[PDB]
Amino acid sequence: RFNSSNDERIRVTSERVENMSMRLEEVNEREHS
Amino acid sequence: RFNSSNDERIRVTSERVENMSMRLEEVNEREHS
């Protein structure tokens, strides 16, 4: 019940979005062509 | 308390998703191969 509530499901999404944005910016800045 | 509320945690996620979508579209449309 704790892991399926709206608050945790928003917090996990926010953290994963932040990490994904950081990795995507790293990928796009480090192009080789 | 302000930075951990649901409203800010949704707004930040929306803005970062917008930026990530723009950058990913730029990456996909512009390819060397």
Contact A24 B20 (CB under 8 A): yes
Q: In chain B, helix, strand, coil percent, each to 5?
A: 75, 0, 25
The residue behind tokens 């709206």 is A6
Dist. CA A24–CA A2, nearest whole Å:
30
B23, A20 contact by CB (below 8 A): no
How was this structure determined? It was done by cryo-EM
* Resolution of this entry, Å: 3.5
Q: Is A19 helix (H, G, I), strand (E, B) or coil?
A: helix
Neighbours of B13 (CB within 10 A): 19
B16, A17 contact by CB (below 8 A): yes
Residues within 8 A of A (CB atoms), B 1-30 only: 6, 9-10, 12-13, 16-17, 19-20, 23-24, 26-27
Residues in chain A: 33
Q: Is A1 helix (H, G, I), strand (E, B) or coil?
A: coil
Nearest one of A26, A17, A6, A31 to B18, comparing CA atoms: A17
CA angle A16, A22, A24 (to 5 degrees): 100
Contact B10 A6 (CB under 8 A): no
Dist. CA B13–CA A16, nearest whole Å:
10
